Amino acid sequence: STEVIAHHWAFAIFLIVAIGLCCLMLVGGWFLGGRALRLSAKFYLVAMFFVIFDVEALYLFAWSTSIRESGWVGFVEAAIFIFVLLAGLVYLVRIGALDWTP
């Protein structure tokens, strides 16, 4: 359609002009103007928790856009999914996995 190809061209022009704007800004900044330890594993733990719960979040993302088309049995399935998610979260909290302080 003409409207969808107009929106595609608008999005492409938006991306190109934004990239060109920031690149030209950096180029003008460079051109103008004269010249003259072992980290603690809690970082890995919190990033790993973010990865796992982001995958669980993607499952809930897929569920949320089709809640009406899934019916009450989909609600029961997603309630079991969310309950397992919350049991894992309670497990992580209670063993001090999510406690940054010692």
Partner 1 sequence: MIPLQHGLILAAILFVLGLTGLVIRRNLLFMLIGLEIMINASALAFVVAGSYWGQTDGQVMYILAISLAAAEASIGLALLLQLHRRRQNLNIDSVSEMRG
Partner 2 sequence: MEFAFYICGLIAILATLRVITHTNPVHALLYLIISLLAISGVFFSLGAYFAGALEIIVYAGAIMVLFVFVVMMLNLSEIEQERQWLKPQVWIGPAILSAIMLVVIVYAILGVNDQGIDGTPISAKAVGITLFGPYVLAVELASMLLLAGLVVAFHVGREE
Partner 3 sequence: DYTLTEIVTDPLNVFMGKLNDMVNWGRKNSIWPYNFGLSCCYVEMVTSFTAVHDVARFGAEVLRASPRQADLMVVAGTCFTKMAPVIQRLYDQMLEPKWVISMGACANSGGMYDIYSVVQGVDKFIPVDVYIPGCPPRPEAYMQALMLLQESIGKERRPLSWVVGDQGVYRANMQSERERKRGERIAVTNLRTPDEI
Ligand X SMILES: CCCCCCCCCCCCCCCCCC(=O)OC[C@H](COP(=O)(O)OCCN)OC(=O)CCCCCCCCCCCCCCCCC
Instruction: Judge contact between 78 and 63, C-beta under 8 A.
Output: yes
15 lines the binding site for partner 1 (CB under 8 A): no
Which CB atom, from 36 or from 55, has the smaller least distance to partner 3? Answer: 36
Q: Judged by CB under 6 A, which of 2, 3, 4, 55 binds ligand X?
A: 4
Binding positions for partner 3, rule: CB under 8 A: 31-36
Angle between helical axes of 67-94 and 42-64 (0-180°, round to 10): 160
Q: Which among 61, 60, 62 is positioned nearest to 80, based on CA atoms?
A: 60
Q: Which residues bind ligand X (CB under 6 A)?
A: 4, 8, 11-12, 15, 83, 86-87, 89-90, 93-94
